[PDB]
Design a protein around this ligand. Structure first.
Ligand SMILES: *[C@@H]1O[C@H](CO)[C@@H](O[C@@H]2O[C@H](C(=O)O)[C@@H](O[C@@H]3O[C@@H](C(=O)O)[C@@H](O)[C@H](OS(=O)(=O)O)[C@H]3O)[C@H](O)[C@H]2O)[C@H](O)[C@H]1O
Ligand SMILES: *[C@@H]1O[C@H](CO)[C@@H](O[C@@H]2O[C@H](C(=O)O)[C@@H](O[C@@H]3O[C@@H](C(=O)O)[C@@H](O)[C@H](OS(=O)(=O)O)[C@H]3O)[C@H](O)[C@H]2O)[C@H](O)[C@H]1O
Ligand SMILES: *[C@@H]1O[C@H](CO)[C@@H](O[C@@H]2O[C@H](C(=O)O)[C@@H](O[C@@H]3O[C@@H](C(=O)O)[C@@H](O)[C@H](OS(=O)(=O)O)[C@H]3O)[C@H](O)[C@H]2O)[C@H](O)[C@H]1O
Ligand SMILES: *[C@@H]1O[C@H](CO)[C@@H](O[C@@H]2O[C@H](C(=O)O)[C@@H](O[C@@H]3O[C@@H](C(=O)O)[C@@H](O)[C@H](OS(=O)(=O)O)[C@H]3O)[C@H](O)[C@H]2O)[C@H](O)[C@H]1O
Ligand SMILES: *[C@@H]1O[C@H](CO)[C@@H](O[C@@H]2O[C@H](C(=O)O)[C@@H](O[C@@H]3O[C@@H](C(=O)O)[C@@H](O)[C@H](OS(=O)(=O)O)[C@H]3O)[C@H](O)[C@H]2O)[C@H](O)[C@H]1O
Lengths: 178, 141, 37, 37, 37, 37, 48
């Protein structure tokens, strides 16, 4: 009879262990998926960054009306979308955060192409896209000396800062380099 | 237990940049721009709290809807929702009235902001007003 | 009953990792704000 | 009669796990305050 | 019966450690390629 | 559970490095713009 | 293992995440968080 008793208890032990063994693995199943994803996104945040090659601006009358930026993806950077990125304009009058649009004005920026197929994505290292920003539609033009602080932020969180300092004189200059 | 603790460590709220208005000759608003951390899930800013260690009052701010008093209001910089971060590319600006929480803000004054999410991950930002605010419509604390 | 003992000990390692994880993040936050300043 | 034995030993495991579980919890607390400071 | 219960849990602990081992190397594999690039 | 504990601690390290990496690049960012002017 | 996504759901765009659990006959479950890369520009094949 003691044999009959230990048999049923033995069936309990294999089932109890199975439940403990099972949830021990599925818990590791969730964490490994989260751990894998976390590593990829964390490295993307550090690496996928935008480098600002240069910035110029058209000059009408005597006040800068447009602010353009030629952007290039940084070293070892995957695809960068210029529509999921926000440019923060810390100017002398306002402080809005510009977003993407489609032909600029208002509190939005437009991206025209320079060298490449896609006019909104940085596919390879050798593509340049021009970021169009309408200063006359964001603040109140851009007279001499009036500097602005631009920080282009990609979706992952990479931030590139650029102080667009207008030349101290805007006389007899059709276009200048901020 | 495993699911909750993993969310505690992983799901965090990062802070991109800070800027505030300048009225007369002092800062009255302290706005932020928050973004999800690496692999963060949906972060409901209506359930998070911000601890304000200012030069004067050191309190804990809750959420409201347009901010003043002892609360913050969250406008949407970019996204579908204006009170919860869903995508990695979502940016939400939290608005805090510095002339209601404290007695405005002057030069040199620093504020220790601890943005604690619902699960428990804490992000601390040391907002420091610029030491001179002469002829500045907006600053970058 | 050996499976039972694993369960609670399993729970412990989740918490201590969470406790251990935190001390680095909030510390690195201080040097983040301090280093920037 | 065999089922009585596994019941009492089961009680031992949960306490033993709890005794062990706390050890890591409190120890991690010390290094948390030690590391933070 | 305790020996039988230990063996089943032993397999899970072996498999769980393998999964944790795996992601650690695979994550390092991606990082070295990204770091090298 | 030793493997499970390793995973959560692993999530801590990547985030800490991500925070630390964020400090240095942004700190050099201001110096780059200030130095150019 | 083949999966026609444009017939199962509606053909994933960028960023769209799918959680898969492959359960064996005996009951063992394996989870995989297949996340599409956030950009599919000029890519013939991607690694989910
Ligand atoms: C940043 O880059 C943008 C790219 O579009 C550039 O935009 C152009 O500025 C011109 C001017 O304001 O400087 C503007 O010129 C008018 O329109 C032209 C065309 O029809 O588009 C043309 O008629 C005349 O200009 S030009 O071709 O002789 O140079 C003029 O009437 C463009 O329309 C405008 O897209 C910004 O100037 C630059 O800062
Ligand atoms: C760079 O990032 C921009 C961010 O806006 C992204 O732009 C969006 O692309 C979408 C798609 O073409 O990928 C497009 O999606 C809309 O909504 C779709 C769906 O209902 O969600 C669908 O109706 C349409 O797109 S598609 O399914 O035909 O591809 C479309 O109406 C968004 O409108 C567009 O802003 C870029 O794609 C990215 O490269
Ligand atoms: C922090 O973020 C808050 C978000 O609300 C922002 O608040 C706005 O500041 C405006 C100003 O910069 O002080 C203020 O402007 C007044 O109200 C406008 C509107 O009726 O709301 C408008 O009449 C006038 O401004 S404008 O449209 O000409 O630019 C002005 O009378 C807004 O009311 C206020 O919500 C903070 O400025 C920022 O620091
Ligand atoms: C961020 O978190 C906020 C928390 O307030 C949430 O908004 C609130 O959600 C509540 C609910 O979870 O939907 C909703 O509650 C109302 O009142 C409940 C009760 O009477 O108190 C109940 O009637 C309903 O909710 S529930 O019990 O079914 O959950 C609902 O009518 C609040 O009104 C709502 O502001 C945000 O959605 C979240 O993003
Ligand atoms: C250059 O630096 C000078 C330093 O004197 C500064 O002017 C001083 O600013 C003080 C303040 O920072 O605004 C101001 O302090 C007054 O008195 C305070 C208190 O009663 O002592 C308080 O009422 C007000 O300041 S504060 O608490 O809000 O900071 C203020 O009324 C001094 O009177 C003023 O000379 C310049 O502003 C700066 O450009």
């Amino acid at each position: 009879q003691v044999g009959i008793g230990t048999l049923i208890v033995f069936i309990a032990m294999v089932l109890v262990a199975a439940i403990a063994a099972g949830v021990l693995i599925n818990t590791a199943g969730y964490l490994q998926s989260k751990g894998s994803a976390t590593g990829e996104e964390a490295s993307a945040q550090v690496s996928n960054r935008i480098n600002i090659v240069s910035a110029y601006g058209n000059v009408x009358x005597x006040x800068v009306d447009y602010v353009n930026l030629t952007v290039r993806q940084a070293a070892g950077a995957d695809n960068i979308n210029l529509x999921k990125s926000t440019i923060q304009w810390i100017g002398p009058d306002x402080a809005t955060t510009l977003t993407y649009x489609x032909x600029x004005x208002x509190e939005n920026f437009t991206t025209x192409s320079i060298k490449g197929x896609x006019x909104x994505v940085l596919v390879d290292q050798s593509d340049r896209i021009k970021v169009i920003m309408y200063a006359x539609x964001v603040x109140x033009x851009l007279x001499x000396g009036x500097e602005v602080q631009l920080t282009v932020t990609t979706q992952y969180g990479s931030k590139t800062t650029y102080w667009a300092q207008v030349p101290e004189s805007l006389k007899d200059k059709n276009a200048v380099x901020l």
